Every structure is written in C-alpha cells, then in structure tokens.
Ligand binder design. Structure first.
Ligand SMILES: [Cl-]
Ligand SMILES: [Cl-]
Ligand SMILES: [Cl-]
Ligand SMILES: [Cl-]
Ligand SMILES: [Cl-]
Ligand SMILES: [Cl-]
Ligand SMILES: [Cl-]
Ligand SMILES: [Cl-]
Ligand SMILES: [Cl-]
Ligand SMILES: [Cl-]
Ligand SMILES: [Cl-]
Ligand SMILES: [Cl-]
Ligand code: NA
Ligand code: NA
Ligand code: NA
Lengths: 156, 166, 156, 156, 166, 166
C-alpha cells in the first residue's frame, strides 16, 4: 500500500498565546483528514516506508475585533515545516513561509493564509511537524489549516 | 421498479440507501444488500444517502465572532450565528459590523440575531442625534417634568429646548 | 489512462461585480490548459475514475488606477476550492486561501496571488469547482489564474 | 529511473540590484537539494525524459533596517516560472505569483513568501527557470527559496 | 545533407519542419514525413517549427491598462501597449505612470505611445510652472495682446508680468 | 552485547556508527561493516551517526543582520549572532531591535552581543534624560569644573544646575 497523510487542525486543541509553538494536535480520520501506512503521534507524522514524498502545508491566520486589539505592532505570521528523527533529537527546517503584517487598522476582520510544498527524500523513522508563530490567530477550519504528504517513488 | 427516496440501483439490482446518521460502508453486492455504519464522533449525514463517508460539523469559531445556536448531531448540521452587533456576510464568509443609522434615523426593533440593522426615519415627536446601529429614535423631552416650559420645538435630529421662565 | 486536468481561466468570460461567485468558464485545451479522463462542464470538473487526487489552485488579483478607485475599503481577497456531487446538491469547502488587503493607497497598480493544494479521496461523479471573492479583480492570464488535479493512486 | 529535481538557492551567488533577473545559480546536491535524470545548467533545469511533471516554486523576500531604507516606494514582489527550449530561443511564462507591498513602515524587519505549483506536459530538451523581481531582497535559506519538479506519468 | 531552415533530422532521416500557422502533430516515421496541423482558435506559431503544440495569444488586459495595437493571428503574436499616460515597465511587467516634468522643464513632443515621458529644459522665451507628464513649455504672454506693457520679464519657471501704465 | 555510543544493531549484527565528519554511505551487510564517507563541501555532522546524508550549514545572512561568530566545519555547526543594536528572537526567528531604557534608567554594561538590553534605575549622583538602548546613566556635572556653584541638585532624570554667583 502506497503511503499518504492529509491532516487537519484539531480545532479543540489549538494552543493559546503569541509565542511560536509546535502544533501537537491534528485530526487523522474525520472530515478530509486521512492517513495510510504512516503513523501520527502528538503532531509528529512518522514515516514508515522509505521514499520520496511530496510534502505540503496550508495555514490560515485570522483575527476579529470582538477578541480585542491585536497585542503589539510587530506582527509576523509564519509557518515552518520541520523534520526530526527518533534517531536525532535535533530538528531542521524543510520549508518556510509567511509575511509581516499590519493588522492594527480599524476594520472588523483580518485574514491571511500561507501555503508551502516540496519534494523530499524521507527515511522510515523520520518525523514531519508544523510550527506556527501566532497560535491564537490560527483558523480552526478543516479547509483552512492542514498539512500532508504522499509518496511519489521508491529510493533505489 | 423502485422509488429514488429510499433506494438506488447498482448492478441491475434495487438496493436500499443509508438512513441519516449512517454512511454507506460498502455497496450492495450480487449476494447482499448495502452495508450502513453509524457516523463517527462529531460527524453527520442529514439525508438518505449513498455516501462514502460522513461530513464533519463546522466550527462555530469565537475568533470569527461565531456562536452555536444549535449544536447538531449525527443526524443534523451545526448552526452558527454572529454575536451581537454583527451579521453574517456570505461574500466575505465573515461576521461584518452592523450598519449604523444616521441622525434622524433609528434602528428598528426587535433587533434580529445574525441579521444587519434596518434603519427607519424618526416619526413626529421623536428624534435621533447620533450614529448608532442599536439605538432607536428617542422621544422628545417633556419640559414640564423638569419644571420648565417648551421654548422651541424639536426636530427628528434634535431635542426640544426647555426654558425656566416666569 | 491516468486522469488529470490543468485548467486556465477563460479570459473572455470572467464575471463582473464584487460579490463572491463560482467561476464557470475555464479553458481545457488551448495553451497550458489540458484534460484527460476527466470531464469539464461550466466550471465543474467531474471525476470519472475513483482515486486519490492532488488538487491545486493559483488565483491572481490585480487592479490598475485607470479603472477608477477600488469601491469600498473592506477588501478581502479569497479563493475556495469546493466539492459537489451530482448525487448531493449541497457543496463543501475542501481548501481555502487569501488575505485582507488595503489597496486604497496612491500607487498606480496593485497585485496579489493565492496558492492552495491538497491530497483528497475522490469518487466518480464528484465535481470540483472554484469560488472567488472579487471577480472583477481577477487576472485573466493563463500563468496567473488556474486550477488542476492529477491522480496519484487507486482507492483499494 | 523516475526523474525529479528539488533545487535550493545558491546563497553565494544571488544577483544584486532591483531589476528583474533570471536566477542562474542553484544547489543540486547539498542539503535538501537533489536531482535525478534531469540536468541543471546555470539556473536552467533541462528535461531529459518526456512526461507530465508537477512543477513548483517557493520564494521568500526579506529586508532588515541595517541595510538602510528600501529604495523607492513602488514595491512589487514577484516570481515567474518560465519555460524555454534549446529549440526555441524565446521563453514563456508557465506560472506567476506575488504581491504589491509597502515595506516603508518603521519596524526593523519585513518578510514575504510566494508559493506556486502546477501540472505541465514537458518534452526532452525543454528548460524550466525562475525569474524574481527584487533579487537583493531574496532569502538565501534553503528552506526558503527553492524550486522543483517531479514526473507523474508518461506522455502516451 | 540539408539546411536547418526548413528541415530537421530525426531517425537518420531529413524531415521537413512545420510552416508558421501549423504545429508538428506527429514526428516523421521511417515510412512517412512530418504531419503538420493548423493551430486551433486563438493560438499561433510564428516560425518554421518542430513544436508539440501552438502558443496561446497574450491577453491585452484593460484591467492592466493594456490595449491591442495588433490582434495577431495563427501566424503572428498579439501586440499590446499601455494606454495614454502610462508606459510598459519590464521589471514589474506592468503599466507604470509616466514621469512628470518639473517647473522649468517640458514634456517632449510628439508623445510616444507605450513609452515614458522625456523631459527637456525650457528654451529662451518659454516657461513651465507646473509638474506635468504631458505639458510642453508654454511661450511667454505678449502684453500687447492684453492692451498692456511688459513690466518685468519672465523666466523658464514663470510668465511675464504685464502692466497697464500711461 | 554492545554500547549505543559508537555502535548500532541492524541485521542481528553489531555494526559501527560513523564518526563526526562522515555520513553512513551504506548500511552494514551480512558480510561487511558500515561504509562511512566524508561530508561534502559546506556540509557537516557533529555526532556519531547512522545518517543518510550530511547537514548543510546555516547562512549567516547579513540581510537578516546576522554575522558568523564561528564558521563551522565538517564536524561543527556554524554559529551566527545579531550585529550591534539587535538580539536574536526565537519567536520571529529574526534580529529584533534592542529595548530602550527610559529616562531614570540606564543600559547595563558590558553590553552582551546577541542579547537584549538590560535596564537598571540610576543610582544616587547619576541621571539619565534620554531613551536609549546603549547609554548608561551619566554622572551629575561638577559645577566647580565650570567655575560655578551648585544652585539646585539633580535627580535621576535631570542634571544639576550650575550658577555663576558672587
Ligand atoms: Cl496529533
Ligand atoms: Cl480524527
Ligand atoms: Cl531531501
Ligand atoms: Cl455542520
Ligand atoms: Cl468551463
Ligand atoms: Cl479550450
Ligand atoms: Cl478526502
Ligand atoms: Cl545553476
Ligand atoms: Cl550543490
Ligand atoms: Cl502544459
Ligand atoms: Cl501573443
Ligand atoms: Cl550550521
Ligand atoms: Na440614529
Ligand atoms: Na513642467
Ligand atoms: Na535612559
């Protein structure tokens, strides 16, 4: 069986605050969320089968005026697609996206989305995970905040 | 021959659809009928269906100024609404600030949840001197309650002026 | 034959106005536009063969000062990748992207592009289509406004 | 062997200036950079085997205040994914992304990223290359500025 | 031996290229020559080619301030230009506002379509008192036409001053 | 039995890991041990490893206000720091402007490279009348050096005032 995963944000477990975090809760079964021959554990997607995978993420940020004013006026909205390995405790950036923003105007709603994708060689045991800059600005919709992988070819 | 209401055809056979709350796990074979399984946690299907898998309920995101007016179940969708002062706009798919009524106009009551403010011009004896999405036209002051007399009459935009004369 | 589609905007049939619409005209043959073992009808891309497809869209918005000032100053530029089914009349969002913008400054030209992509399980009969927020701001170039799909693997 | 390439920016050879250029230096071996059954020459990725490839690019722009003020205040950050052919000297846009920006505020750092992707029919001899608007704003990180291709299916 | 102008080699054979307006539908086999088919609607190829498929004409998007000066056909590309007041810039790939000439300078005529304004300093007897991308230097007023006399002479930046004296 | 420090198990065999500066080119077979090859140009591995390929050194981008304090090699990672006036922030992954100390407070010395300014209130006999991320509290003026007398004493926010009296 050919491996893949399309993981959508666990809307009931998005961390609060304004410091950068690793997202550690995603759906793997309900809605468009799915997984096959890969394993998922606290936001770390484990590769079970060696190969070249296409990796992708879509992240949406949003803020409404009923939540009060957006804290300070340095605002940089970022995603990092990160690789670790049960072998190597240390982690490294595979892909990075985002923009600096000024959401301090006087309109009721603010929105921004980031998309990234790439083709990577992955070994069994390696883990893929997502980091975001402003967790309390994350859009909890399944069509909005997600990441995935699918195998394209074997190593050889 | 069979009705499209509760049935569907497949392999030259009339097979039964799945009831709301259940999805079509496997299609009817030449030897058995449809297999229907209950929708998983937080999922639903609201019709008699041939559906591969169940639909996930929408999030009533408070961060979008949304709130559940109806939670939904395995049979019914969740219903959200914009919290007070905002209304749903299907262009932005977002909760937009309600329209304000200019002076001379008041906000019509009762104010409808999730719907934009309707403005009406103030009638005789009433006025509005503010921009507001919530305020109705307020009636003129009665000078006699202040122990005074009506000096000059009001408009739809301004109140009466009271005088303490003798 | 393995199914795919890369569809570019029909520049001669972009709807006008500022309300959100479903784009109902795309090229399927000329230029980079192509289709194989999928069918296309008024902006609905029908799946003919069950499988896991990778879905993607790129949407560009633009405005020049010779068109006059950009109407009101609430501006949110959005794409929605939507799934329907000849079976189920109702439609659901698969993917969503975009940003709030302020294009009311005093420079002659304004530009913004959205990209989205994801891996989805699709059944024959299901239809994919695109919704955009500000149709009269759409870039009619083939390298600019397009969407596509290609099959990666069978259902099993 | 199935063809692919994931190419990351050669950080030691990013051109200077503010005029649009073709990027002519990428890594093909170190880090996440890799290539197989395709050839790479001065920023032109040559196709060796006919087929349908998925093409993608991620481009990041950045500016810090220690470099001085950002020149003029018309700023449009753009990527173009371009196709040429040793056959045809002329080149054509396949994909285009980006945004107009105002980075003249008083914060110390500014950032923006572009992503694009699409499915294209490619013949042996054809070359893919990247153009960017503001080369001296390019992020030299390997997770930041890259482009790639991988074959999905044969022509037939 | 054969020329690269109208021919190409393939399977140890000299085969004929496709004429402008036609694309290479199938390469020459060991038994037949090239097969060339006409370009479809709104497509072109402008050279003698071995091309897989035809090129789509560019859009002269009015929303980008562009206009067709030449429509093109199956044989020729379409030509666009920026409408009055703008010029094409190959950095932004967009129609940029023309440069304005400061006071003391005028816009050179004839003004070229799709090209940026060229500024020239005003010559003796002419002036410019505005920033403009279109205005040439205007000549000094002749006081006698106003029934007046020249009080003080003009510059390149200001006009003459006329006086009604006796 | 063997230690995890320099060894790893694979096919029921105890095989040797690769030394820093080398990557695991091919795993141990049933007939040979591990094959380890040197890291290519600008690449490193800093531990005893079973690694497929080497890691690329980070760029100390001057455009991000970064500078190498340690270049690294095939064995060690590269070390970057924010240039004077800025400090590394792991939220934005960027060099943020240092915090300024308000009047009455001074910047603590020695100033640490790549670390944000620490503010301290001015002690008796010292003052600070500016917002600054670099300036320490400066001591009061001694009027006698100006040939004058102390008229009024200073604060932590203002200097002494000197008078030339008799
Ligand atoms: Cl998880
Ligand atoms: Cl789940
Ligand atoms: Cl890789
Ligand atoms: Cl729902
Ligand atoms: Cl269509
Ligand atoms: Cl077509
Ligand atoms: Cl799905
Ligand atoms: Cl190169
Ligand atoms: Cl390299
Ligand atoms: Cl193509
Ligand atoms: Cl053309
Ligand atoms: Cl390093
Ligand atoms: Na009112
Ligand atoms: Na002038
Ligand atoms: Na101070």
């Amino acid at each position: 069986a050919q491996p893949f995963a399309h993981l959508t944000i666990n809307a009931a477990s998005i961390p609060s605050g304004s410091h950068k975090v690793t997202l550690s809760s995603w759906y793997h079964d309900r809605g468009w969320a799915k997984i096959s021959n890969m394993t998922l554990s606290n936001g770390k997607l484990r590769v079970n089968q060696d190969g070249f995978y296409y990796l992708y993420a879509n992240i949406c940020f949003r803020h409404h005026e009923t939540s009060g004013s957006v804290p300070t006026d340095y605002l940089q909205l970022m995603v990092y697609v990160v690789k670790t390995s049960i072998k190597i405790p240390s982690s490294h950036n595979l892909m990075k996206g985002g923009s600096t923003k000024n959401w301090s105007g006087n309109s009721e709603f603010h929105f921004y989305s980031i998309n990234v994708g790439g083709f990577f060689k992955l070994r069994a045991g390696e883990e893929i995970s997502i980091q975001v800059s402003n967790p309390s600005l994350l859009d909890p919709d399944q069509d909005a905040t997600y990441f995935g992988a699918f195998k394209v070819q074997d190593i050889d | 021959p069979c009705t499209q209401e509760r049935h569907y055809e497949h392999l030259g056979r009339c097979c039964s659809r799945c009831e709301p709350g259940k999805y079509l796990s496997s299609k009817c074979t030449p030897t058995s009928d449809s297999v229907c399984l209950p929708c998983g946690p937080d999922e639903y299907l609201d019709t008699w269906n041939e559906e591969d898998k169940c639909l996930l309920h929408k999030v009533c995101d408070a961060g979008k100024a949304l709130v559940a007016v109806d939670p939904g179940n395995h049979t019914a969708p969740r219903r959200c609404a914009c919290t007070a002062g905002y209304h749903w706009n299907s262009d932005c798919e977002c909760c937009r600030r309600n329209t304000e009524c200019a002076p001379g106009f008041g906000a019509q009551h009762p104010l409808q949840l999730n719907k934009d403010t309707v403005c009406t011009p103030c009638l005789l004896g009433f006025f509005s001197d503010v921009f507001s999405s919530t305020d109705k036209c307020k009636p003129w002051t009665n000078c006699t309650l202040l122990g005074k007399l009506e000096a000059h009459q009001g408009t739809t935009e301004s109140d009466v002026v009271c005088s303490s004369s003798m």
